[PDB]
Paper text:
Goose parvovirus (GPV) is a member of Parvoviridae, a family of non-enveloped single-stranded DNA (ssDNA) viruses with T = 1 icosahedral capsids. Adeno-associated viruses (AAVs) are also in this genus, which are widely used as vectors for gene therapy applications. It is noteworthy to mention that few dependoparvoviruses, such as GPV and Muscovy duck parvovirus (MDPV), are pathogenic and do not require coinfection with a helper virus to replicate in host cells. Goose parvovirus (GPV) is an etiological agent of Derzsy’s disease, afflicting geese and Muscovy ducks worldwide.
From these micrographs, capsid images were used to reconstruct a 3D GPV capsid structure with a final resolution of 2.43 Å. The GPV capsid structure shows surface morphologies generally conserved among parvoviruses, including five-fold channels, three-fold protrusions, two-fold depressions, and two/three-fold walls. The overall GPV VP structure conserves the core β-strand A, the eight-stranded anti-parallel β-barrel (βB-βI), and the α-helix A, as well as the general positioning of the surface loops. Significant differences were observed in several variable regions, including VR-III, VR-IV, VR-V, and VR-VII. GPV has the largest VR-III loop, which is a result of AAV5, AAV2, and QAAV possessing one, two, or three amino acid deletions in the corresponding region, respectively. In short, GPV may not interact with SIA nor HSPG for transduction initiation, and it is unlikely that the GPV capsid binds to AAVR. Monomer alignments of GPV, QAAV, AAV2, and AAV5 show that the DE and HI loops (which form the five-fold region) of GPV have very similar conformations, which explains its mAb 2–7 recognition.
Residue numbers in the entry:
A (entry chain I), B (entry chain A), C (entry chain J): 214 to 732
Amino acid sequence: ADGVGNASGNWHCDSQWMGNTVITKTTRTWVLPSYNNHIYKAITSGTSQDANVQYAGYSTPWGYFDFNRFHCHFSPRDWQRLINNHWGIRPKSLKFKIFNVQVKEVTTQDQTKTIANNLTSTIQVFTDDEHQLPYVLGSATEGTMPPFPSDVYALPQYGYCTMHTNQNGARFNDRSAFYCLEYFPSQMLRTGNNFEFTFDFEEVPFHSMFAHSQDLDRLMNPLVDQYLWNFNEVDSSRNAQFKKAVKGAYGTMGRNWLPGPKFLDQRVRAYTGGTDNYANWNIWSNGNKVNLKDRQYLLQPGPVSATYTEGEASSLPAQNILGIAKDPYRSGSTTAGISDIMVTEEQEVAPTNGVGWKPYGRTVTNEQNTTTAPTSSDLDVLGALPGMVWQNRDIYLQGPIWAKIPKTDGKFHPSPNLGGFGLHNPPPQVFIKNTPVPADPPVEYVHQKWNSYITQYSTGQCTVEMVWELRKENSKRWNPEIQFTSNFSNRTSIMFAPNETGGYVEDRLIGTRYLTQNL
Amino acid sequence: ADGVGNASGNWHCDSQWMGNTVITKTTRTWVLPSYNNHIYKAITSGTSQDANVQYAGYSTPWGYFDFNRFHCHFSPRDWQRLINNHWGIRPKSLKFKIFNVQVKEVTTQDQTKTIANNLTSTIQVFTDDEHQLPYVLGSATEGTMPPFPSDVYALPQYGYCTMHTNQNGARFNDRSAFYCLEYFPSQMLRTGNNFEFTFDFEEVPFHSMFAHSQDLDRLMNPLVDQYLWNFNEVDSSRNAQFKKAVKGAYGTMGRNWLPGPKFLDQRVRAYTGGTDNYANWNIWSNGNKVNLKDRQYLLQPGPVSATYTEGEASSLPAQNILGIAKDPYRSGSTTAGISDIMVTEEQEVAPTNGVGWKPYGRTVTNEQNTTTAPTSSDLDVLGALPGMVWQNRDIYLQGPIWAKIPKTDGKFHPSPNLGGFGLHNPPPQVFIKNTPVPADPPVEYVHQKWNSYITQYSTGQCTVEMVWELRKENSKRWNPEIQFTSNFSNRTSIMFAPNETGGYVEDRLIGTRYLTQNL
Amino acid sequence: ADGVGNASGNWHCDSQWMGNTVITKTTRTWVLPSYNNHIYKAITSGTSQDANVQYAGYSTPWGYFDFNRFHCHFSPRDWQRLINNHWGIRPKSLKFKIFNVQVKEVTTQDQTKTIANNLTSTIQVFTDDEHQLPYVLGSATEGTMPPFPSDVYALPQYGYCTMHTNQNGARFNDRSAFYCLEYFPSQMLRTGNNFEFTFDFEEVPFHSMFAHSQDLDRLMNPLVDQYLWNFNEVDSSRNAQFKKAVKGAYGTMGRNWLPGPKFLDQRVRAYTGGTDNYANWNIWSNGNKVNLKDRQYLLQPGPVSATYTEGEASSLPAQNILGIAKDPYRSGSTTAGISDIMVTEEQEVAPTNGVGWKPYGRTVTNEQNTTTAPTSSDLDVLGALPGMVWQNRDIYLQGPIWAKIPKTDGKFHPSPNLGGFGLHNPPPQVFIKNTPVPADPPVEYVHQKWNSYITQYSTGQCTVEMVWELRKENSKRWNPEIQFTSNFSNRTSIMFAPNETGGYVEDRLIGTRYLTQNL
């Protein structure tokens, strides 16, 4: 294909806007180590007796590419052009390349590393097109490409969980599956070789890049009464009374449509002002949980809900938020306060979704009679009922693009709770390993497992080219709308740029919902 | 197009039944005033501090046509032919005309009005085809065409609500949208000119014009046992016992299908007999409510439920009913009793839907053991679960035809709670205004807003032509069925006709569900 | 394209003279380090509180090529053929190549550097054709190619200034723009690869390579009187008197044309003889300045003016000169005297431009009457008035070729003050970087920014080929003209050649204006 002295690819980063489509291209330099030192390891939770944290699986010698966050594909300026001018976006097609491969050997002598080119060494690359391997993308995990184009990123090690059991610690059972990645055809690359593949997204709904400019309970003409007559009260004579729904009677009016279903969330005050928190409680005791088998885990974030009520504006739904550290590299060994963490604000869905820590509503709790007074209480948690409408969670420049829909007999509204595009056929996983280069063999043959290798690592460039379909904003609104703008003011470095020491700084989460549209 | 002395259209009222389709045509005389005196007004709830009743929006100089009730398009006799002979109906296409336009000027001198033709004055008409304006149809509000063909109807004024906030009264915010209707292309009509447009409905499910002749729990052959063995009890020895489901064991039988999901409603006795009401309580305190943002409002009517259990036949689900005044013009300033109000009766859905004030069922509340006895309670409110089946609300001659489905990421069974056809693309709103005719200008130019106008109003005729698709009744039932008939007996005027003073009288609600069909 | 063992280009240095065009070709060896160690740095003036020196911007990992001085493209002998034989020159087209690329790695062990070829490493090259990056060429800054063909030149690091504000030091604001150069498509080159592009200059005026042989006030025939009669005086009787402009009356004659507009400059005596200087004053206090925002800066050099009056021949306009060190590498840490600095002499423009420290002329300062005597003073600074004509600044073998015209709504005579060709579309900037080669990655994946790299640098050859359009000298002058010649006499090394230690010596500035032409 190509020799030692020719480049096998070129650098491509741009965004192209044509018609109803935008094409993003981005190139990175990647680094791949040799993981596990060329073996598979059965990994578990060990002696841990807590069923909730138990797991069983395998770490592999293979690495992988994760481009599943938007800021991989969009500059902040391009994200601005997207969210200010368009009502919708969905992924269409994908092209991925690996080129300019460099395999290197590391030799240590007397605490002295020397790095040299190994020109005859290979890397192996394959994509899993039929989704025959455990799919670890779409879990919102690190190891994604860094947003900034000149940043290098080490490829994460591939591993997976498989079925486990609880007896005196995690154990594999008969349903536990092992996957050898060397049991798949992969092409081998020396420095001259390159790799590419293409992918087409299935048809999915456009993400809704707008906020509603109307509330689900305001849909009627304010100037006219309804012709409906609703039950009002029972008179002292015990006879039922009916009241006409009249203009301004909004509490009593009959409606065709209901807010979407929700869990109840606990409210926390994350910002200055408003109703203050109770002290010394953790979400693990008091939060929403999911029972699965013998295990519990916190239900986070669940379907999206409105973030706050006005006047309570500093409060958050505890578990309904996506937190992201302002410093991507901040260590998770210690907790952080609100000042260190970017938290998503879902207020755009307030017209249809209801606020997280508000109950869905009230429910009648009894059947009344002459001697039984009517009673009612809160409806905290409610499933789907005919007439409900809701918005999905917003997508963020720093958030995940897609998630793989689990393969199941049934689903309800398969929109991922973390946000993004639910896909029956997500983009295939791209696996990469350094081909093992054995060390010096013994002169006299011995029967043993081969543990001796030359230390290798590889580096190169990768281009990701995505095509995005757009819905144009079409609106007769007379007055100006809300736009995302730079209101950062005076700074010691440019926002969404490198700082003095070269660290890339994105301290603000950016959603898509700025333009408005009627219900 | 046409002069002063030629009619621009003819009167058309008929119903045509051909094959699987019925075509309704109806003509009315309309009256349009000049609303707001040619200005837009920002309208709010004012100083009201109650968040529940707050709103913000605009009243417009424009009027509009609302034909969204069935009795606009169907005579009572045609409605009878529909409901006795057919299993289903859905709208197909729509044609609307405005013609024979007459613009008139009103001059008042010394408390004396004179009305004269203004031959050079215009009206403006446009339809909003792309649904770019706030859609106020489908809220079951007055200003619809009157059922009776020779009744004149004044066109209602168009207004809308837009996003508001709660601080010290209702306020507009940055998401609040203003819409100038003069920012749309509209054709202008003098007395010779006419207007028309056509519309096609999207494919929607046929309304179910039948009642089920079977109950969801009776579906099996009564002559045969099941081969299923269900858990029955635990013996005094603590061992589980299994009982065979045998013919007649209907309470214990395994089934494939579940009744539809429901809210629990409070029961009220609206008629003579049965269990009497508790005294002096109102639905606002005790009823089902919806939390939306910081607001509450009564959940009415919600998905349809069965109206009563037999022997309780006089009771109603409080909030699950559509009330309609027997006198359409009865003032809403005072409450009414059952004798003044027509209330819908949903008993046809009793086979699948369950009764409004009955809980869905019972639920086990605990995990038993040797020292823990099993407990259970009522399941009042339940969302959708696999295996549920239900009926939608019935449509009525006096009820709404369609509702606009809110534009949202997700929906569950988008059938409108008030009944009718949920539409992603409903029929477009038809807006009409009297073109402002300015009064005498000042001889010397002055810089000021122009407030001086000649008083105008317009009148004309409008034809609505709808095409309806039908499903023919196909049944092997041997015995006669239920039919809608005239059983009114002796009256001082014909029912569904004018009375002595010319008022049109429809005192009986008429559903579609008479014919029966098996589950 | 090419392997390890083949050259990807050849050495080209020549000048071709054909017809009205000259083609210059020149080749250099370049060296590129890795700047900033593969990061962008936000750079400011720091804690400096002086608004005049404040700045904000970015240094980039990229380098660039600057060939924007004439002695890059012309040997002294070719410059001689140009200026002695031609009246005009302008750039036409440009071709640039990068070839014979060598990427090398530096390894330090125990204070011992070893340099080795890295055969699989790349460089990245792109040109900014649409001028989408801050354009730093045309500011007369170092980092240009050295004149002498066998000299190697390190490529300068690319950086730029962006909008800043003054508050407690320089700050970035919302108008400050960051530019990632990796957000541009660039081709990647191994040792076999090469690069080229072509460019066409827009039509610009020929530089005027001649001096005028007439003065703007001598244009008339000396043998004939004018027929004009000019106001002369007012007699003791108060009546106005008119005097005929007669041959020899040059001070009183009417003329069609005016000298060009000018700032007033301060005169300094830079050479022996003439009127001596005042002592102990600096130009920062006493010089011409420009107010821009809250900042001041010295107005240098401004539009060109004549350098001196005869008899004052040792004086200079203080700020109107281009100084260039006779030693290009003399450090700027200390001031230099005239003997160390080559200073341009603009005397060729004396016919039309007026001398820098002379005022433009005299102006009447009052409106006289019987009791008010006429007064007048100096006109120091004057803008453009109808009838003015002027010459631009001369171009020098050691001076800049072009400058980018700022993109603005309006311009007056967009000829650069430093001299050369003002261009709306200047030659594109050529950016080059060493592709980062990552070092050994950690075996166990960690989430951190990648700071580990192998030290790289690159070298190669670059050819610049420019096409120049010429205007031929056409003159009927009988007597010989002024020519540029070698009058250096006896030297220890050849002038415009290397010295004993190999340093290239050009101690004399050479303008283009030798041939003469009438006004």
